[PDB]
Amino acid sequence: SRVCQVTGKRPVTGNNRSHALNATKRRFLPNLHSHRFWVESEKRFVTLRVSAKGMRVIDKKGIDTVLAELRARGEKY
Amino acid sequence: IKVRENEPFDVALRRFKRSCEKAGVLAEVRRREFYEKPTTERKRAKASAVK
Amino acid sequence: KVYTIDEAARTAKFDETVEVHAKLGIDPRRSDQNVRGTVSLPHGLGKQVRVLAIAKGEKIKEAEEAGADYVGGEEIIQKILDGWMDFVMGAVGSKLGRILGPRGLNPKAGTVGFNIGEIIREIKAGRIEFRNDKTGAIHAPVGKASFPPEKLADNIRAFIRALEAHKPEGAKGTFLRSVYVTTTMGPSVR
Amino acid sequence: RKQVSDGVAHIHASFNNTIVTITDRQGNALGWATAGGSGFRGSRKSTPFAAQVAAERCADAVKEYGIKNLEVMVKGPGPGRESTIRALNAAGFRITNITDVTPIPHNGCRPPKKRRV
Amino acid sequence: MQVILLDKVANLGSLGDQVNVKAGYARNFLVPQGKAVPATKKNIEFFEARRAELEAKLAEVLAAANARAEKINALETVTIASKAGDEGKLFGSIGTRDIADAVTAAGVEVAKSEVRLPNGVLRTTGEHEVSFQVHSEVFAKVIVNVVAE
RNA sequence: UUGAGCCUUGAUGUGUAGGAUAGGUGGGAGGCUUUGAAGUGUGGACGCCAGUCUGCAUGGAGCCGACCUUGAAAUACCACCCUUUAAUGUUUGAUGUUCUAACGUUGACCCGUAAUCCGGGUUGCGGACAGUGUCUGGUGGGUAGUUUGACUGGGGCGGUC
RNA sequence: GUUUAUUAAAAACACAGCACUGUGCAAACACGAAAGUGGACGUAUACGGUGUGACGCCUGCCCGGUGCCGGAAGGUUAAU
Ligand SMILES: [Mg+2]
Ligand SMILES: [Mg+2]
Ligand SMILES: [Mg+2]
Ligand SMILES: [Mg+2]
Ligand SMILES: [Mg+2]
Ligand SMILES: [Mg+2]
């Protein structure tokens, strides 16, 4: 289900305010994308369903640390 | 149809065109089809060309 | 350069033939092209004129020595009126107009003065310095500038001749100073 | 731009008008001019004269690659069929060989009917 | 990102610079095929330790693979006990492991393939010369004197 | 390297009294070209085929100004350049060209596997396109929620407020 | 043949037939936030939608309006 394994971002609900301020319940899905990642420390491709924000977090912390979190909460990858 | 006409002369010299094409087969095909009426047309090219 | 390389004229004979041809905005709405009264330009330059004003039969012995060389007479209002190859300038004011001595039918010569006490007043310098520059076709400012006798000393105009930046049209960018003539050509910036 | 010298003047002479096209040997269009392109409309353009002044105009247009000697290919009946090659000779041209290229079906398409006039 | 490179890397890199690259290129191509790496600061000084070491230090050590030849012209003469036939023309002859082994075997320690006796290499007695090699640009001359004893 | 911003290196004009195809005003009573010209002769070429130009060239040693008209006078020279075009840029996207490595594969194969799922792997084909997220203009009775007045010799029509 | 089970069996619906129009297949389309599935283990002589309704003889004029289709130069025009 549309969830970013890095950040936990998942859909949230809100409103579509028309010009006349009519509210209609809506969603905001996150920019999810399944993406293969080269884990050098594993000679293997780990693909993660990640949000774009997700990737940037992986770019900064580094896939080892990031997977090392999934691992540290049994979020299996 | 074709004229080489090499060096000396700027006169056209293509009287060969009055030997076939031009109003030859070209006035012919220009228009009304014909079909069987040429028969009659050429039956004067001979009712004449007898003498 | 930051200002101008006033060393931008190193062959004619006397390269004073330079001009004040700057840039102004456009007419997107309502603006015009005008000049004040004989813009003198902070610089003696070195110009002796023959300024033509329309005084009377008294202003011929003191209304003629103040940066000029003569003044139209009283008999010569229309007794100078019989030719096109025969005939600054002037036209006194207050309540006096001069379409009866400059009107219908191709020349500009407005600034002379308007005095009710003197013909050459105790403190009245500024006339015979620099010309005018009204409307033309694609802008304004045409006239004259420094000379072959100065240095960056005729760049006294550079801070009080380019400083004549009065309200620009609207949708424009008025700002660009240039001059020169009789050797090459150019300008710096604003 | 570019240059040739050895060329070909194509002409399309047809009762209503005659069109002069001047191209190199490998027919790649170097310049053209029409009887209508110049002036005259109606009768006017369907004349040997009008075709002369187009044959002319065409020169001041292909001379722009300095052509020197050129063949001539003549298509269709109608004026300007020959009067054009005269204005070409003069124009300032070695005029190499002349050929006629008017197409002749071996009796194929039925041509139009009528001209009850 | 910034990212600091590893190998030379084409129209941008160098071998150990701090360029700046589009992340699409860094992930997906460069860093995976380890041609570069995140400029995690932690790293950029991992590289500052690597900006003092090998360079500043081991090139005044090739100023020793060089000043070996400051002792190539301060003697400038070894003799070889090689005699002479029928007129002062070597009964012997001396090459590279003769001019490197009769160079090493004193206070002049050279690597046997660091002695260029272009051939003469060699076919007569008396004084000769040779091209002694320790660095790629800095070699040095001597004088050799095959002594007919 | 295509369509736009804009800036150095250059063009250019048949309203009458006339040597004659006057852009508007401005510096202006002598610059210059032997750093090798006026136009004869063809070269690119704008084209209302009325005429203009020059890198080059055959050339080889002066032309003119207030002159007398015209609402405006010099192709004597210079420019800020408008009637509208034309030759590099700068980058920037932009239309563009490939690449492969993100990504798609509802081709083939391998293994987990006695499995038309799925996962991994290999290959083929695509490829920064497609697709999806956020934002955004358009469309949208498909759905939804509502509105759609009152007086009135019943109501409606008409009329009126 | 069908239909208002219970006041209407009909001229209404369907029908073979015809015409338009969509659809190159991971089809259009339809049920589904989605995965998945019908269409179809089909592939334009197929599949969907719309109208007309065996057959015979036939089906003219109008594209201004409203829909739809095509257009690219101008104009106007979103976030940015
Ligand atoms: Mg409704
Ligand atoms: Mg009521
Ligand atoms: Mg019933
Ligand atoms: Mg019943
Ligand atoms: Mg069908
Ligand atoms: Mg029906």
XYZ file of N, CA and C in Angstrom, chain B:
153
model
N 13.403 15.285 -82.515
C 13.212 15.289 -81.073
C 14.476 15.791 -80.403
N 15.616 15.418 -80.970
C 16.906 15.782 -80.408
C 17.777 16.395 -81.493
N 18.497 17.457 -81.144
C 19.432 18.077 -82.078
C 20.749 18.428 -81.384
N 21.837 17.851 -81.888
C 23.166 18.118 -81.360
C 23.612 19.494 -81.834
N 23.612 19.678 -83.152
C 23.973 20.951 -83.769
C 25.173 21.583 -83.063
N 26.367 21.188 -83.494
C 27.602 21.545 -82.799
C 27.994 23.028 -82.868
N 28.953 23.360 -83.732
C 29.637 24.656 -83.649
C 28.896 25.827 -84.314
N 29.053 25.991 -85.643
C 28.695 27.272 -86.253
C 27.234 27.371 -86.697
N 26.426 28.094 -85.922
C 25.021 28.364 -86.240
C 24.186 28.521 -84.971
N 23.548 29.679 -84.828
C 22.684 29.944 -83.680
C 21.213 29.824 -84.071
N 20.972 29.656 -85.367
C 19.665 29.251 -85.859
C 19.289 27.923 -85.210
N 18.039 27.819 -84.763
C 17.553 26.620 -84.082
C 17.843 25.382 -84.915
N 17.187 25.307 -86.067
C 17.401 24.232 -87.029
C 16.600 22.992 -86.648
N 15.637 23.159 -85.743
C 14.811 22.035 -85.317
C 13.465 22.048 -86.023
N 13.506 21.587 -87.263
C 12.340 21.474 -88.107
C 11.890 20.028 -87.969
N 12.684 19.277 -87.214
C 12.394 17.899 -86.874
C 11.097 17.830 -86.070
N 10.768 18.917 -85.377
C 9.552 18.952 -84.567
C 8.309 18.992 -85.434
N 8.468 19.454 -86.667
C 7.371 19.432 -87.617
C 7.449 18.137 -88.430
N 7.955 17.086 -87.784
C 8.103 15.776 -88.405
C 7.487 14.671 -87.549
N 6.777 15.038 -86.481
C 6.153 14.036 -85.610
C 5.305 14.620 -84.463
N 5.940 14.946 -83.338
C 5.221 15.434 -82.156
C 4.523 16.769 -82.445
N 4.402 17.635 -81.439
C 3.726 18.917 -81.626
C 2.270 18.654 -82.002
N 1.668 19.547 -82.782
C 0.281 19.384 -83.208
C 0.028 18.024 -83.865
N 1.075 17.222 -84.021
C 0.901 15.842 -84.425
C 0.012 15.112 -83.439
N 0.581 14.133 -82.741
C -0.196 13.345 -81.789
C -0.683 14.196 -80.613
N -0.222 15.441 -80.517
C -0.563 16.269 -79.362
C -1.831 17.094 -79.547
N -2.147 17.470 -80.778
C -3.444 18.074 -81.041
C -4.456 16.940 -81.017
N -4.000 15.766 -81.442
C -4.818 14.562 -81.443
C -5.381 14.296 -80.045
N -4.504 13.918 -79.116
C -4.910 13.486 -77.778
C -5.480 14.624 -76.918
N -5.170 15.866 -77.274
C -5.597 17.029 -76.489
C -7.002 16.903 -75.909
N -7.958 16.449 -76.716
C -9.359 16.573 -76.327
C -10.261 15.362 -76.642
N -11.395 15.619 -77.293
C -12.562 14.732 -77.208
C -12.335 13.287 -77.620
N -11.613 12.553 -76.791
C -11.693 11.105 -76.837
C -11.841 10.520 -78.269
N -12.993 10.755 -78.904
C -13.313 10.249 -80.249
C -14.070 8.890 -80.228
N -13.340 7.783 -80.386
C -13.867 6.416 -80.181
C -14.408 5.665 -81.412
N -15.108 6.355 -82.307
C -15.607 5.747 -83.550
C -16.382 6.815 -84.289
N -15.625 7.527 -85.103
C -15.894 8.897 -85.473
C -14.569 9.323 -86.077
N -13.456 8.840 -85.485
C -12.174 8.796 -86.192
C -12.308 7.932 -87.430
N -12.935 6.772 -87.270
C -13.325 5.961 -88.412
C -13.890 6.866 -89.498
N -14.839 7.723 -89.126
C -15.474 8.613 -90.096
C -14.490 9.701 -90.494
N -13.708 10.169 -89.526
C -12.729 11.215 -89.776
C -11.705 10.749 -90.807
N -11.208 9.524 -90.646
C -10.187 8.987 -91.542
C -10.804 8.453 -92.827
N -12.125 8.310 -92.835
C -12.832 7.933 -94.049
C -13.039 9.165 -94.921
N -12.428 10.276 -94.521
C -12.318 11.455 -95.375
C -10.855 11.728 -95.693
N -9.961 11.172 -94.881
C -8.536 11.219 -95.169
C -8.224 10.273 -96.324
N -9.244 9.545 -96.779
C -9.094 8.630 -97.905
C -10.107 8.897 -99.019
N -11.325 9.299 -98.658
C -12.298 9.730 -99.657
C -11.760 10.979 -100.344
N -10.802 11.625 -99.686
C -10.051 12.717 -100.283
C -8.823 12.152 -100.988
N -7.976 11.477 -100.216
C -6.688 10.998 -100.706
C -6.784 9.890 -101.763
N -7.961 9.699 -102.356
C -8.062 8.884 -103.563
C -7.699 9.788 -104.738
N -8.149 11.036 -104.648
C -7.866 12.070 -105.639
C -8.940 13.140 -105.518
